[PDB]
Amino acid sequence: RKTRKESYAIYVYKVLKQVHPDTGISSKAMSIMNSFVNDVFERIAGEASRLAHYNKRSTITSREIQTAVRLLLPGELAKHAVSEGTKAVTKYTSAK
Template sequence: MAEPGSGSPSPAEGPLVCQDPEKASSPDRKQRKPRPRHRRRRRRLGTSQQPTFAIYFPKLLKEIHAGLSLSKEAKAVLDCFVRDLFERIADEAASLVRNKRGSTLTYTDIQSGMRLVLPTQLYTYADSQANKALVKFISSK
């Protein structure tokens, strides 16, 4: 067991003094081997690290209902819903492009995919919002 006061250096060792790095006794730099550099490994996005739409939900909710917030479970459900809807629209738009033997996905293809996937009222609202965002983007250039 340690004796009380053993935390301080003993007189035989001498006091601990910080030395100037230039004056400290160290092997010559030419003799010292350089540290091996580790290669940076690319991180693979796992299921928990995939990009999500969760950062946009509070911003949108603040515009509609200022005092409300969402729980983690609600954000997860909304994220799954948005991802599923996005995949459905993208799949429909891609199949339309394949059917017309094209190689470029255009705005009209996405509009047609939205029309096929979404109900009528939701499609008209989404289309008007998309047009408004497109006009805002083009005018900001």
């Protein structure tokens, strides 16, 4: 008996505490957030893979994920996610 099914449960809880520090979450709602993360993940990685096949490329970089987000998120949600992502890639490429 040794099998660990991976999840995003601790990370959803950490982001919840970093947003609502006094509000908890049930395990059913945790499963719904886990499947939402898995779903959106598959959508963006799907669109990125499709784009890479379209443009005769084999390397998925931040630009492919960026235009996949600009496709998949509706408008201002896409603008906020492209800003947050470019901010985190800026912080990543110039860190310790």
